[PDB]
Design a protein around this ligand. Structure first.
Ligand SMILES: Cc1ccc(OC(C)(C)C(=O)NCCS)cc1
Ligand SMILES: Cc1ccc(OC(C)(C)C(=O)NCCS)cc1
Ligand SMILES: [Mg+2]
Ligand SMILES: [Mg+2]
Ligand SMILES: [Mg+2]
Ligand SMILES: [Mg+2]
Ligand SMILES: [Mg+2]
Ligand SMILES: [Mg+2]
Lengths: 236, 5, 236, 5
């Protein structure tokens, strides 16, 4: 690793600086170096890792969608043949996205998940595993497409099972997991009814538990609850 | 697109 | 060059796709490959080259400013010592910025400028040369700082001399050159009076020539004239 | 920052 010679604490400090500078590729490389030191991550450090890669892959996905749209239009009836360039460049972006997802999944498998015993860490990492398989699924077309979808489903389902046993229904990680597993059902698994049921049940069970929270916890939980409602509004 | 976190 | 095996026209097509996808690093690498084919650039291709690198270096400069601000604060009286990390990461970003500027200046010197005979190409490239020396000047602190400032000044001045002889006062390239040379005077050369005089004279001489233009040319010229007025408002 | 193009 090009980060092997840098102190763990200095990698963490630089990831925070890269975030303030909106340099998310650097942020991700610093956090990859920190993970590769081999020690478990704290709650704040897991946040830095997830923010960095979410921003990197989010930009890649937005670019891939622009390029896929152009490519689909070029394959319509009456379109002038522009040659292989649109497909090639969509493939270039796709391969770079797949590379980032494989990197994150590699960090989770070697060895973040196996050392994560507390619900707050284990659910967070298994949600991330479902998220990055989901991004692989968004671009998948080959023999392994169903297996990529099932890998996402399996990781999300293990996270859900732990979160229901070990976390209150307002826990922001539990809420965000349910938000994203619901989007998996709607966009990836062609299961809009399951997506809507999960978002609604998650919202209602959180609502009933808000009374237990402090003002600051209430703010955190209701922010994610509003994202569930936003999706329900989009889908109904 | 729908919201994720 | 990693782009040596790709057709010039396919590099240009992919630069346009990268622009639509907001993938400006890719856009710049595609345009570097196109320049390295050795043929002169058309007006549209010069625009693609300048848009790509302006966006790449603009992001670098914004990150450098965030980091420099943090570093300056850490060097104030009463600040807790955070170690070398802020300086190191500011240096990392700075070195990457300098690398991009050297790449652009290299394309201009080998061999865009020497083959550019028409005013519209030669002024555009000499403005770019002044711009990228100016970005080097923004971060310069060493023995060569005055020489970097003078390189920017010299390129801008040659561009101004050609533009005054060969272009109408409303030409958008002439206007943009004057806009940026005025910013050079204000920010780099510590000459705010020269910056204000140049912006005002450029604005007034363009105003007097608007009557010669079509509606579309008028729209192009007045857009840049408004940037001159915006700067004058900021400075007065 | 001031405007440039
Ligand atoms: C799984 C998950 C649950 C809640 C989150 O909360 C928001 C979106 C407010 C956030 O930006 N947190 C910092 C990054 S950990 C994020 C991720
Ligand atoms: C030297 C210069 C003069 C005018 C320009 O016009 C605007 C800013 C409207 C533009 O985006 N043009 C396309 C990129 S060439 C740009 C550069
Ligand atoms: Mg150590
Ligand atoms: Mg592929
Ligand atoms: Mg159920
Ligand atoms: Mg050829
Ligand atoms: Mg330096
Ligand atoms: Mg004068």
């Amino acid at each position: 690793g090009a980060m092997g010679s840098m102190e763990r604490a200095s990698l963490i400090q630089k990831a925070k600086l890269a975030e303030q500078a909106e340099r998310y590729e650097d942020m991700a490389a610093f956090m990859k170096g920190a993970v590769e030191k081999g020690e478990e991550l704290s709650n704040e450090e897991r946040c830095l890792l997830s923010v960095a890669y979410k921003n990197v892959v989010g930009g890649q996905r937005a670019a891939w969608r622009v390029l896929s749209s152009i490519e689909q239009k070029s394959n319509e009836e009456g379109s002038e043949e522009k040659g292989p360039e649109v497909r090639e460049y969509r493939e270039k972006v796709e391969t770079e996205l797949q590379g980032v997802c494989d990197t994150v999944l590699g960090l989770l498998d070697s060895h973040l998940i196996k050392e994560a015993g507390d619900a707050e860490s284990r659910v967070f990492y298994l949600k991330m595993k479902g998220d990055y398989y989901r991004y692989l699924a968004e671009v998948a077309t080959g023999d392994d497409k169903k297996r990529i979808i099932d890998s996402a489903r399996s990781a999300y389902q293990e996270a859900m099972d732990i979160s229901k046993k070990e976390m209150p229904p307002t826990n922001p990680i539990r809420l965000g997991l349910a938000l994203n597993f619901s989007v998996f059902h709607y966009e990836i698994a062609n299961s809009p009814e399951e997506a809507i049921s999960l978002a609604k049940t998650t919202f209602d069970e959180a609502m009933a538990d808000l009374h237990t929270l402090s003002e600051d916890s209430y703010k955190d939980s209701t922010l994610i609850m509003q994202l569930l409602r936003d999706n329900l509004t989009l889908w109904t | 697109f729908p919201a994720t976190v």
